[PDB]
Amino acid sequence: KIELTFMFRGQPQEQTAYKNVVKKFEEKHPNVKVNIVVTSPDQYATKLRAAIAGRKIPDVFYFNPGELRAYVNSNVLLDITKYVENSKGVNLQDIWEKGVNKYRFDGEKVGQGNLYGLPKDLGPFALGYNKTMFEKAGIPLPDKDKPYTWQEFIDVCKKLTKDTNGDGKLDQWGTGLNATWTLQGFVWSNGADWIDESKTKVTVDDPKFIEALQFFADMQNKYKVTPSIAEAQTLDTYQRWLRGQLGFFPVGPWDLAAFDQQIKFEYDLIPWPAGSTGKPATWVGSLGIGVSSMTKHPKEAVELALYLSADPEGQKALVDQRVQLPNSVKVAEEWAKDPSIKPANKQEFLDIINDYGHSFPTEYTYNGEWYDEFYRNLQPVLDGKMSAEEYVKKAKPKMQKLLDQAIEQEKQASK
Ligand SMILES: OC[C@@H]1O[C@@H](OC[C@@H]2O[C@@H](OC[C@@H]3O[C@@H](O)[C@H](O)[C@H]3O)[C@H](O)[C@H]2O)[C@H](O)[C@H]1O
Numbered sequence: 001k002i003e004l005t006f007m008f009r010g011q012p013q014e015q016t017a018y019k020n021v022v023k024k025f026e027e028k029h030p031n032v033k034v035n036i037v038v039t040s041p042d043q044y045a046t047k048l049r050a051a052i053a054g055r056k057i058p059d060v061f062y063f064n065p066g067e068l069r070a071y072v073n074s075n076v077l078l079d080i081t082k083y084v085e086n087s088k089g090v091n092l093q094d095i096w097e098k099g100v101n102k103y104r105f106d107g108e109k110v111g112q113g114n115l116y117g118l119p120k121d122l123g124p125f126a127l128g129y130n131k132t133m134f135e136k137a138g139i140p141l142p143d144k145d146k147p148y149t150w151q152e153f154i155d156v157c158k159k160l161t162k163d164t165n166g167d168g169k170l171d172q173w174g175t176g177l178n179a180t181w182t183l184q185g186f187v188w189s190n191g192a193d194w195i196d197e198s199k200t201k202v203t204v205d206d207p208k209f210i211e212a213l214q215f216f217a218d219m220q221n222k223y224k225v226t227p228s229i230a231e232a233q234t235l236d237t238y239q240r241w242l243r244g245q246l247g248f249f250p251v252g253p254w255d256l257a258a259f260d261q262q263i264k265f266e267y268d269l270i271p272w273p274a275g276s277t278g279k280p281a282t283w284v285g286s287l288g289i290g291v292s293s294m295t296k297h298p299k300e301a302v303e304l305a306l307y308l309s310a311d312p313e314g315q316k317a318l319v320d321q322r323v324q325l326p327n328s329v330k331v332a333e334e335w336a337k338d339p340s341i342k343p344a345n346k347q348e349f350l351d352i353i354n355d356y357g358h359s360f361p362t363e364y365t366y367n368g369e370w371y372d373e374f375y376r377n378l379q380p381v382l383d384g385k386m387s388a389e390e391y392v393k394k395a396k397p398k399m400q401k402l403l404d405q406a407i408e409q410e411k412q413a414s415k
């Protein structure tokens, strides 16, 4: 008799897994029907923005932690605190505190107070390597604790870059990193960031940032340890990693089902190479599961969010289907130690969460437009047509204007 709309995003394997788990919810609650709206990850922001702009908000939906404050100011997210407290058996205290706190807001600041969502997951972005490739090449395996230096990383990547079938053409490469998702770790481990400590000033013109960005671009253009510009256009580097053509590529827990299906070589996880700080860095992602402030069925909507986020049955199903690591800390710790479940160094995911993982800079700001502007015109740097130094000088004032506007807009919307 009750109908809920559940809006979310995922790669094909994630869509299938969540659709399966929603069906399990519907078996458990036969009086609730869940109507699904699902998109690809890149489509999602646009489609959710449109829903909110028209005030036709789905009952339950994914959202970005960087939108939490804006969504509260505009009365988008229901305060679900009391529903979560009253629910049978639920124990959020078992869930990653880092995850739960991203969706708490006390009226002034994030991290404390009322719950406005539940964590879908934590998404530590690890570095994988192709063990099959290393062993066929006779290269000593990477250490699972001590990061490569940047120069050591380039050195091994060069050794891996070769013509393996002897037709005279390179057909295997050290790596092929996507700047959108992998620049951050090089920037951070080199002691830089997109913004200052106060999160109000753009700092991409820091020499440490420039060094990190130029190093990144140089992997393709100078050190030549990646497919060429044309080769990556022909077949993108994620696909080339699946086919066993690349030595190194990132791995998120959401990748595991796709990798189970398509990757035939042995791979394992390692820390990211470290810049001047000598400490590895990468991001820990998260999405929240929120409830529409205007839902006609808040109890059932929170029950769906809880089933996906915290319920041991719903959680076990998601972990079994290899699209995330457990939200329960104790379950995650014994998961990581189970050697029958690969990669062998699953533990690296937990090390990222507990130690060297950072948030995206936009998680700190009222909106992300300032950061999107950095990436919007970045490709000429990546393709060697413009220096890192020249680009960040040009981008910085455009970014700063947008950031200033985000800051002002928060002041206005929170009045
Ligand atoms: O193009 C290959 C894909 O890109 C890289 O992933 C980057 C993006 O991460 C996934 O989203 C993960 C979720 O967002 C996190 O905040 C949350 O913790 C996760 O559930 C998107 O599907 C990707 O576009 C990887 O190399 C590969 O998956």
Ligand SMILES: [Ca+2]
Residues within 6 Å of the ligand: 162, 163, 164, 165, 166, 167, 168, 169, 170, 171
């Ligand atoms: Ca060849």
